[PDB]
Structure 1
Amino acid sequence: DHRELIGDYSKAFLLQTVDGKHQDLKYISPETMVALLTGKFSNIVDKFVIVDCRYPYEYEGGHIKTAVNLPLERDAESFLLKSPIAPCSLDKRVILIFHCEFSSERGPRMCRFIRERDRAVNDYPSLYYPEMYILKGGYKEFFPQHPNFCEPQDYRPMNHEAFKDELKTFRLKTRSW
């Protein structure tokens, strides 16, 4: 591989990455998301968690199959770090994929937050989640390309006319503005 090692310096990144806003983060395309969903990496990837950081109404109006909705930092830490999601075999990998509507600001931030917490509870350079990626373009670019991998087969933008109130209600739940 021509890149650096994953977070615990144990091995190279598995997935092919594409260029994204944050030069230091690893992004993947809809295509690689589908290869994982289709089991193309089944002999090496034990588990892969898709974290959809969007607000609940967004997730309810259409999300990627198997994805988990973890819109708040506290929910993500609770879900991923209280009892780490570990592979059934040590020859195997666990991978996290973060995304939001277009995975621009919120996705990167949650990803950076989980890495910090992970660095915090482990002895360097050990990690529970050494390999993390962001889905370039988020759901918004994923849906039109592979609608049958989404449930419900639909899309609800964050700024949807009819949920202005839910967006407001929801922002008031975040730890900081």
Structure 2
Amino acid sequence: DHRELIGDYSKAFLLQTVDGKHQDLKYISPETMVALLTGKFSNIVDKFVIVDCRYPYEYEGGHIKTAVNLPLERDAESFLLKSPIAPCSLDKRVILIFHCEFSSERGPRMCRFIRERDRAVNDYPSLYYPEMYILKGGYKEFFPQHPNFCEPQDYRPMNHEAFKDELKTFRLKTRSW
């Protein structure tokens, strides 16, 4: 591999990465997303969690099969760090994939946050989650290409004109603005 090692310096990144806006983050394409969902890496990957950082209305409107919705910092901390998700095999890996609508703001921030807490609660340089990726293009790019991997087969934009009140309500739930 021509790149650096993963978070705890144990080995290299498994997946092929593409270029994305945040230069220090690892991005994967929708194609690689379908590869994991179809079991292409089942020999090596024990578990991969898809974290959709969108607001609840957006997720309900249609999300990638198997994804979990964790919009608030607190929920994510609770789901991932209280009782970490471990591989059933010493040999196998655990991988996290974050995404939002455009994978421009929400997703990358959540990725950076979980990394901060993973570092904070372990002895350097161990991590519960050494390998994390962003799905480049977010749900917006994913739906029109692989609709049968989405449930329901539909797409609800955050700015959806009929969910204006729900957006405001939701933001008043956030740790900070």
C-alpha displacement of 1:151: 0.1
Measured in 2, the distance between the counterparts of 1:156 and 1:11 equals 38
Measured in 2, the distance between the counterparts of 1:49 and 1:66 equals 8
Are residues 1:9 and 2:18 paired? no
Measured in 2, the distance between the counterparts of 1:140 and 1:73 equals 22
Measured in 2, the distance between the counterparts of 1:90 and 1:174 equals 37
> After the TM superposition, which residues 23-102 of structure 1 pair with which residues of structure 2 at under 5 Å, given as runs?
23-102=23-102
Runs of 4+ aligned residues of structure 1 deviating over 3 Å after TM superposition are none
Are residues 1:118 and 2:88 paired? no
C-alpha displacement of 1:33: 0.3
C-alpha displacement of 1:4: 0.2
Measured in 1, the distance between the counterparts of 2:95 and 2:79 equals 14
SS state at 1:175 partner: coil
Measured in 1, the distance between the counterparts of 2:81 and 2:90 equals 18
1:138-175 alpha-carbon deviations (Å, 9 max, x no partner):
00000000000000000000000000000000000000
Measured in 1, the distance between the counterparts of 2:96 and 2:115 equals 11
Give me the identity figure in percent. 100
C-alpha displacement of 1:92: 0.3
Q: TM-score by structure 2 length?
A: 1.00
C-alpha displacement of 1:90: 1.1
Measured in 2, the distance between the counterparts of 1:141 and 1:116 equals 28
C-alpha displacement of 1:59: 0.1
SS state at 2:114 partner: helix
SS state at 1:161 partner: coil
Measured in 2, the distance between the counterparts of 1:67 and 1:106 equals 16
Q: CA RMSD, aligned part only?
A: 0.3
Measured in 1, the distance between the counterparts of 2:42 and 2:123 equals 29
Q: TM-score by structure 1 length?
A: 1.00
Gap runs ≥5 in structure 1? none
SS state at 1:57 partner: helix
Measured in 2, the distance between the counterparts of 1:157 and 1:96 equals 24
C-alpha displacement of 1:106: 1.0
Aligned residues: 177
1:33-61 alpha-carbon deviations (Å, 9 max, x no partner):
00000000000000000000000000000
1:79-119 alpha-carbon deviations (Å, 9 max, x no partner):
00000000000100000000000100111100000000000
C-alpha displacement of 1:16: 0.3
SS state at 1:133 partner: strand
SS state at 1:168 partner: helix
